[PDB]
């Protein structure tokens, strides 16, 4: 179960927190009104975080502390809503029987028990806040039968704990107050219990063959990948609109629209034209690049292979209703010998084509597309980038 | 009215009607009879308004616990009047004290109340004071202090009409206004024609009377 590991890590945290030799010291304050022992101030825990965790931002360490304290690992002695506030207020750890890691789950009758007990310990005031008084009103109206032993065991517990010493009753009642704060919190702050429903739950011959495919699994050195990754970063590094953008026009930040609108304009910017020059794949991604490359191929009387590859791609878009209607037709137009558009195949290519053409398939012309595609990538794109039209358009 | 007993409210209203007497009083000339009746009417009005109000609130608290434990009608409207008559009595014995000192010693012999002083060189008569009215004020102060502690803790109930708001604010208002009134009039023995005073009594009365009629009575048609 996932969150179990999370709670385990934070358990590591608090275990290092109340360390014998290091740790925060749980002090005993003396006041003009009273003498309160076994507390400490939130500035202490803030300092402890910053020391032993090296959390550079005070705010960041404070937010870590915030959610920790909203998972019941320490609470403010005079408040319902768990929030760590860096100041002189008094805190306390929680008990190993009342962590939240212990799969606990209170229920409505037990909330009634704690309500009767708190309301009946003191009888000097309605020692409570308006939300908890509201909850008790509902519990009354709906629990008409079962009240009595609730009251019974409540005052029984009151005697069984008051019989022990006066500071004991105080600390135990403080703890077993806060632990019900965290498991039924004030209307505002988020519950920290819930979870998402998603987590709501020959033999050696194939073995040996896996070993052999790992052998023939061609790999390259990490330095090679390093160069590839750095270089693919660099070639658009000057295009990153987060890090260093030359067009400062930011429709988000600087309330402009012109950047995208220039992007909509079919006329390519000089960035655009320099960016075409990296790879014809990116070109074909560009509609503008498709148009200009196709123009050159036409004016050079060489506008077929691109026509084919566009044909393959535009075929790979329609549903299964038209796959046969196109495959036979595209064969008869390009891959049927005797048609004007003469795609050119070798032995195994045309063999594969002839065998598959009976059956229209989502991966029909894979090897032929590879063949013509390596052809175009090897020949066309180079001369295009080398071409006068490319140079004249990249100049301005 | 079932949430808040009939007879409590008739009690309140009657009492405060009577508390409106200070300001039909002064229009007539000051004499013996005047200042005496003033103190009668004041103190009667005072207890039989603020006192019963405070005790209603005490009942709220007790019915709460009574009801939390075993609905068995812990405190009833039958209980209020008894812890009223006590106070009514005490105040009777007091008035008899003061009233006796006058009516048996300083009626005719040596002192009086119909009595005037002067601003610069001009005359003005009135009633006046001694240490008793001081102690009177300080009692009113403490009494409502107790009432305020009551309307302090009782701040969280799930209740119908939020009477607590209304009551508690009458209480606080009254304490304040009374402190001020008495402090002024108990510095100002010398600088007080009839008019300026009559201003002051008009203030105190319409303020707290109208206030602590309204805050409780009127919202019980909304």
From Swiss-Prot, chain A:
Q: What mutagenesis or variant effect is reported for residue 252 to F?
A: Diminishes interaction with GNB5
According to the entry, every stretch annotated as the RGS domain falls at: 279-394
Subcellular locations according to the entry = Cytoplasm, Cytosol; Cytoplasm; Cell membrane; Membrane
UniProt entry keywords in alphabetical sequence: Cell membrane, Cytoplasm, GTPase activation, Lipoprotein, Membrane, Palmitate, Phosphoprotein, Signal transduction inhibitor, Ubl conjugation
* Gene3D superfamilies reported for this sequence: 1.10.1240.60, Regulator of G-protein Signalling 4, domain 2 (1.10.167.10), Transducin (heterotrimeric G protein), gamma chain (4.10.260.10), Winged helix-like DNA-binding domain superfamily/Winged helix DNA-binding domain (1.10.10.10)
Residues bearing the modification Phosphoserine = 380
UniProt-listed InterPro entries: DEP_dom, G-protein_gamma-like_dom, GGL_sf, RGS, RGS6/7/9/11, RGS6/7/9/11_DHEX_sf, RGS_DHEX, RGS_sf
* GO CC annotations, alphabetized: cell tip; cytoplasm; cytosol; dendrite terminus; glutamatergic synapse; neuron projection; nucleus; plasma membrane
Membrane topology designation: Peripheral membrane protein
Modification after translation (UniProt): Palmitoylated. Ubiquitinated, leading to rapid proteasomal degradation.
User: GO biological process annotations for this chain's record?
Assistant: G protein-coupled receptor signaling pathway; intracellular signal transduction; negative regulation of G protein-coupled receptor signaling pathway; positive regulation of GTPase activity; regulation of postsynaptic membrane potential
Molecular function via GO: G-protein alpha-subunit binding; G-protein beta-subunit binding; GTPase activator activity; GTPase activity
Where the record annotates domain G protein gamma, the positions are 202-262
List each copy of the DEP domain by range.
20-95
User: What is its biological role?
Assistant: GTPase activator component of the RGS7-GNB5 complex that regulates G protein-coupled receptor signaling cascades. The RGS7-GNB5 complex acts as an inhibitor signal transduction by promoting the GTPase activity of G protein alpha subunits, such as GNAO1, thereby driving them into their inactive GDP-bound form. May play a role in synaptic vesicle exocytosis. Glycine-dependent regulation of the RGS7-GNB5 complex by GPR158 affects mood and cognition via its ability to regulate neuronal excitability in L2/L3 pyramidal neurons of the prefrontal cortex.
- Binding partners and assembly: Interacts with GNB5, forming the RGS7-GNB5 complex. Interacts with GPR158; promotes the GTPase activator activity of the RGS7-GNB5 complex in absence of glycine, in contrast GTPase activator activity of the RGS7-GNB5 complex is inhibited in presence of glycine. Interacts with GPR179. Interacts with PKD1; this prevents rapid proteasomal degradation. Interacts with RGS7BP, leading to regulate the subcellular location of the heterodimer formed with GNB5. Interacts (phosphorylated form) with 14-3-3 protein YWHAQ. Interacts with SNAPIN. Interacts with GNAI1. Interacts with GNAO1, GNAI3 and GNAZ.
Q: What is this protein called?
A: Regulator of G-protein signaling 7
Tell me which species this is from: Homo sapiens (Human)
Curated annotation (Swiss-Prot), chain B:
Disulphide bridges, residue numbers: 35-127
Provide the effect of residue 163 to H. Induces an increase of cAMP levels
Membrane topology (Cytoplasmic): 56-79, 152-165
- The residues on the Extracellular side of the membrane are 29-32, 102-130, 188-196
**Which parts of the chain span the membrane according to its record?**
6-28, 33-55, 80-101, 131-151, 166-187, 197-218
Subcellular compartments: Cell membrane; Postsynaptic cell membrane; Presynaptic cell membrane; Nucleus
Effect on the protein upon substituting residue 132 to A: Does not affect ability to regulate cAMP levels
- Biological role: Metabotropic receptor for glycine that controls synapse formation and function in the brain. Acts as an atypical G-protein coupled receptor that recruits and regulates the RGS7-GNB5 complex instead of activating G proteins. In absence of glycine ligand, promotes the GTPase activator activity of RGS7, increasing the GTPase activity of G protein alpha subunits, thereby driving them into their inactive GDP-bound form.
Domain topic, free-text comment = The Cache-like region shares similarity with the Cache domain, a well-known receptor for amino acids. It acts as a ligand-binding module that recognizes and binds glycine and taurine.
| Similarity section | Belongs to the G-protein coupled receptor 3 family.
Subunit annotation? Homodimer. Associates with the RGS7-GNB5 complex, promoting its localization to the cell membrane and regulating its GTPase activator activity. Interacts (via VCPWE motifs) with GNAO1. Interacts with GPC4. Interacts with EGFLAM.
Name by which UniProt lists this protein: Metabotropic glycine receptor
> Source species, please?
Homo sapiens
Lineage of producing organism: Eukaryota, Metazoa, Chordata, Craniata, Vertebrata
The gene that this protein is the product of is: GPR158
- Which stretch of the intact protein is present? 447 to 668 of 1215
């Amino acid at each position: 179960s996932p969150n179990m590991l999370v709670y385990r890590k934070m358990e590591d945290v608090i275990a290092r927190m109340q360390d014998e030799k290091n740790g925060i010291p749980i002090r005993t304050v003396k006041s003009f009104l009273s003498k309160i022992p076994s507390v400490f101030s939130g500035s202490d825990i803030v300092q402890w975080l910053i020391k032993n965790l090296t959390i550079e931002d005070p705010v960041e360490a404070l937010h870590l502390g915030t959610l920790m304290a909203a998972h019941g690992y320490f609470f403010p002695i005079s408040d319902h809503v768990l929030t760590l506030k860096d100041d002189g207020t008094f805190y306390r750890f929680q008990t190993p029987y009342f962590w939240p890691s212990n799969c606990w789950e209170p229920e409505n009758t037990d909330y009634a028990v704690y309500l009767c007990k708190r309301t009946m310990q003191n009888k000097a005031r309605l020692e409570l806040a308006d939300y908890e008084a509201e909850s008790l009103a509902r519990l009354q109206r709906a629990f008409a039968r079962k009240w009595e032993f609730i009251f019974m065991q409540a005052e029984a517990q009151a005697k069984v704990d008051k019989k022990r010493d006066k500071i004991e009753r105080k600390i135990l009642d403080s703890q077993e107050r806060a632990f019900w704060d965290v498991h039924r919190p004030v209307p505002g702050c988020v519950n920290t219990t819930e979870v998402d429903i998603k987590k709501s739950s020959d033999e050696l011959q194939q073995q040996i063959k896996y070993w052999q495919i790992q052998l023939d699994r061609h790999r390259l050195k990490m330095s090679k990948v390093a160069d590839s990754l750095l270089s693919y970063t660099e070639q658009y590094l000057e295009y990153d609109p987060f890090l260093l953008p030359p067009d400062p026009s930011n429709p988000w930040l600087s309330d402009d629209t012109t950047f995208w609108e220039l992007e909509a304009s079919k006329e390519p910017s000089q960035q655009r034209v320099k960016r075409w020059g990296f790879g014809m794949d990116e070109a074909l991604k560009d509609p503008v690049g498709r148009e200009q490359f196709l123009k050159f191929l036409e004016s050079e009387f060489s506008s077929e292979n691109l026509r084919f590859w566009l044909a393959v791609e535009d075929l790979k878009k329609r549903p299964i209703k038209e796959v046969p209607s196109r495959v036979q037709e595209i064969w008869q137009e390009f891959l049927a010998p005797g048609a004007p558009s003469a795609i050119n195949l070798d032995s195994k290519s045309y063999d594969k084509t002839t065998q598959n053409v009976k059956e229209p398939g989502r991966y029909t012309f894979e090897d032929a597309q590879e063949h013509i595609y390596k052809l175009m990538k090897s020949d066309s794109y180079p001369r295009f980038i080398r071409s006068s039209a490319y140079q004249e358009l990249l100049q301005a | 009215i079932r949430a808040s007993g009939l007879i409590l409210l008739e009690t309140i209203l009657f009492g405060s009607l009577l508390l409106y007497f200070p300001v039909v009083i002064l229009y007539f000339e000051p004499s013996t009879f005047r200042c005496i009746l003033l103190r009668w009417a004041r103190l009667l009005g005072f207890a039989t308004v603020y006192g019963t109000v405070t005790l209603k609130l005490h009942r709220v608290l007790k019915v709460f616990l009574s009801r939390t434990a075993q609905r068995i009608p812990y405190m009833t409207g039958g209980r209020v009047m008894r812890m009223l008559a006590v106070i009514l009595l005490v105040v009777f014995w007091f008035l008899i004290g003061w009233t006796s000192s006058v009516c048996q010693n300083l009626e005719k012999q040596i002192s009086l109340i119909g009595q005037g002083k002067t601003s610069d060189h001009l005359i003005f008569n009135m009633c006046l004071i001694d240490r008793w009215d001081y102690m009177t004020a300080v009692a009113e102060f403490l009494f409502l202090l107790w009432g305020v502690y009551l309307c302090y803790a009782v701040r969280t109930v799930p209740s119908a009409f939020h009477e607590p708001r209304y009551m508690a604010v009458a209480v606080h208002n009254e304490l304040i206004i009374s402190a001020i009134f008495h402090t002024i009039r108990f510095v100002l023995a010398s600088r007080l024609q009839s008019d300026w005073m009559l201003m002051l009594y008009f203030a105190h009365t319409h303020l707290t009377v109208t206030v602590t009629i309204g805050l409780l009575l009127i919202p019980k048609f909304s």
